[PDB]
From Swiss-Prot:
Top-level taxonomic group: Eukaryota
Source species: Mus musculus (Mouse)
Anaphylatoxin-like domain ranges (all copies): 26-60
Listed name of the protein: C5a anaphylatoxin
Residues of the full protein shown: 679 to 745 of 1680
Subcellular location(s) of the protein: Secreted
Functional description taken from the UniProt entry: Mediator of local inflammatory process released following cleavage by C5 convertase. Acts by binding to its receptor (C5AR1 or C5AR2), activating G protein-coupled receptor signaling and inducing a variety of responses including intracellular calcium release, contraction of smooth muscle, increased vascular permeability, and histamine release from mast cells and basophilic leukocytes. C5a is also a potent chemokine which stimulates the locomotion of polymorphonuclear leukocytes and directs their migration toward sites of inflammation.
Gene transcribed to yield this protein: C5
Chain residue ranges for the region called Involved in C5AR1 binding: 20-49
Amino acid sequence: GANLHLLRQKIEEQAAKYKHSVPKKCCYDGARVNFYETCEERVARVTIGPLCIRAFNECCTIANKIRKE
């Protein structure tokens, strides 16, 4: 199915753009598969902080786009 190799390396590239651990983890969390909600739906649930929200949304978007194709 989806290129999971590419998936992991693209997410790691994105998490590396963040300075601190928590936004990195928000990235990895956003990148996890969710069959029932879009990335906007999912990130709308998160209120930890602006940088966490941004990383979550960015990595979700990256992950789902890779899955889509």
